[PDB]
Amino acid sequence: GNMSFVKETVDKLLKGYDIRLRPDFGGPPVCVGMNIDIASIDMVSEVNMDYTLTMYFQQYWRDKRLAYSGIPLNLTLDNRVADQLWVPDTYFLNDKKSFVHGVTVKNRMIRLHPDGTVLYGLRITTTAACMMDLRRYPLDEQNCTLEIESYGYTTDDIEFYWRGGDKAVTGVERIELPQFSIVEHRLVSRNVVFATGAYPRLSLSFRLKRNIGYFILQTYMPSILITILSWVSFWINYDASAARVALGITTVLTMTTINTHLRETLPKIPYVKAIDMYLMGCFVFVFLALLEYAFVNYIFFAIDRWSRIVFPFTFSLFNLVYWLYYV
Amino acid sequence: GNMSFVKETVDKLLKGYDIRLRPDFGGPPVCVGMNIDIASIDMVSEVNMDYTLTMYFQQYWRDKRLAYSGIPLNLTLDNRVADQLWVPDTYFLNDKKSFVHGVTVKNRMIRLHPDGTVLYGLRITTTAACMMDLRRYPLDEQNCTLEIESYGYTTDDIEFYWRGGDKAVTGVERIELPQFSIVEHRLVSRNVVFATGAYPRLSLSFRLKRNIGYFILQTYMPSILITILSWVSFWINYDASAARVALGITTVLTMTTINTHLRETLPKIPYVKAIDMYLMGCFVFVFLALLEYAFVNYIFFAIDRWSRIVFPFTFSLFNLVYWLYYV
């Protein structure tokens, strides 16, 4: 209540405070507790193999230099005080581009406690790398992590833990990605060794399951409809050369445009995906339908009836095998 | 352990310290050791002729002004101390855009040693130029370098070396580019002379080998399939003018769309690439197939049978010569 008294207390705390030295410098490591509140996952990019996360990132530690007596309150201080305090040198090892939000002020909090516990909160948006295995795309499940580490302090000097264990990360239910469901999240803690020493690591990972629905509609269904269209040829008279050759060409060429378009939406991976296998199967069907007419055409100068049954039935077999293997 | 003692020692080190003067100013050059830990190569752009690298960049040197006694520890200091110290004026001569990561703090380390050795680490993402020879594209091998130099200090004042020789750069095995394999990396050291004097240079280069698989699927296979499609014409009766002319047109025009699309994905180079040579060969085949019908059409008002053998066989020869020359 007495602001001169509080001002005096805080001034005394910061008098001769050396930001260069961690708490308990030269002694046992400072234990830093971390908890995350997820705000959003804005984007997941296959082409860039990354995702964009917004979170409230909070760090908990004790700095005995900041302990104060005679005030039974927790002091919430203006965020600019953070520039006069030691804070951990935490970074995101797999981040590509990150920033602290700055409107209307730097989205930063400092709360002091009488025992010298410092609560430091930041609102961060990060684009973080996530190598994806697209062999089963778009029936794939991905593991995207966020790796949290101390930049310069080894485990001799700093230690990390998930504050609250399995409850340290909240808001996973808020994530609303149209193309993915969050199946699971996990929290891991370990030490990572480099040439410069052993460093504390915390890892947050999510399991993302792609929703098929968009792909059924966008790629699978057009390919099915083109393949069915190709079969119309078999019910046309063999003398209708222009009509039946037109059907063959248009379906074959449409399947090429669909294939090439699709792979321009994705990174230039050297392996065959699940969707590639489907499109290649559909291409073979429609190409053989045109070749069937060439064969009919070739001899006329029963085969159509046999084509009318064998082609739809074989396509059913193809689909059965495909969707069983991958679903 | 005694933080007042450590604070006193460090304050004494920085008392009267002149950041303007290099260590041993006016004396022999300061030897700066450099080691790199590669985190990622995010992107390689043919259109922009550049690549994006993330690395941990560390500099080693001795500053006798910072030597301290009576403390048998290496002091890890808050990264903000870097602003009160001399550091080398290292830059990347072929970089296009670079930044030091800033979340949650500037990704920077300072470690002092009792003898006055300073360890200075930065986490940097750089987009760096890489002129590519695309004459054999996409069967090409590229050499992309990173050129490290002192901006303002000559070899009279500063010297660079790879700390650890051939082990100074780690993490090359981590690089996972879908479209490239890292064949080799090399470390070079030399002096570079400009009008303003001789400057120390370190060069890190990689040899990148393009993976063919994507290109086989995306461009080579469609072109093969269009060329085969063109041959169907030769099995159609010569009276089927609409059918056979349709085949000629559609294949010719499809090969033009494939060509023009492809070169819109690449820089506006004035020379012919390997892929251009293939597409031009395929164009000639399908164009001649249509011209073959014009010739048949021209006289009807044996040639088809001779076309049925000579065209596929010639395409096989064309492919044999091509893939031998380039693979």
Partner: nanobody, 121 residues
Framework: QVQLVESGGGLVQGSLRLSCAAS????????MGWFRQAPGKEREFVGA????????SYADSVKDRFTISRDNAKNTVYLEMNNLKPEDTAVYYC??????????????????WGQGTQVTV
């Protein structure tokens, strides 16, 4: 979750080919390492290979003697131990490293350890 079974050790006086067959989620663990533990001594780095690309690295002791490579079809890595020496007498272990799990050289960075073939010469 990776399982590693190694075979082809044994006792010889000579060229040898240790093999290391992986199965499971190998995508999350792109690097395979070879270690060896002599009796008494600490567990020691031999070499490592990336599954994708085959980017290889060796300890000095075995540089230009041993050669590692792999085949992704079988999910198999092999240490081709040529030009053997009586220093090369240890339980050779295979291990998998996570993508972000640190330096190649440090066995504590590795999670999934093979059984370990004893090799004496």
């Amino acid at each position: 979750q990776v399982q590693l079974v190694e075979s082809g050790g044994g006792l010889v006086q000579g060229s040898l080919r240790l093999s290391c067959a992986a199965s499971g989620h190998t995508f999350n663990y792109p690097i395979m390492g070879w270690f060896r533990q002599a009796p008494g001594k600490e567990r020691e780095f031999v070499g490592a290979i990336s599954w994708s690309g085959g980017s290889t690295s060796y300890a000095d002791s075995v540089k230009d003697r041993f050669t590692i490579s792999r085949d992704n079809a079988k999910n198999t890595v092999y240490l081709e131990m040529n030009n053997l020496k009586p220093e090369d007498t240890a339980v050779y272990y295979c291990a998998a490293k996570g993508r972000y799990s640190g330096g190649l050289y440090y066995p504590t960075n590795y999670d999934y350890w093979g059984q370990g073939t004893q090799v004496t010469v």
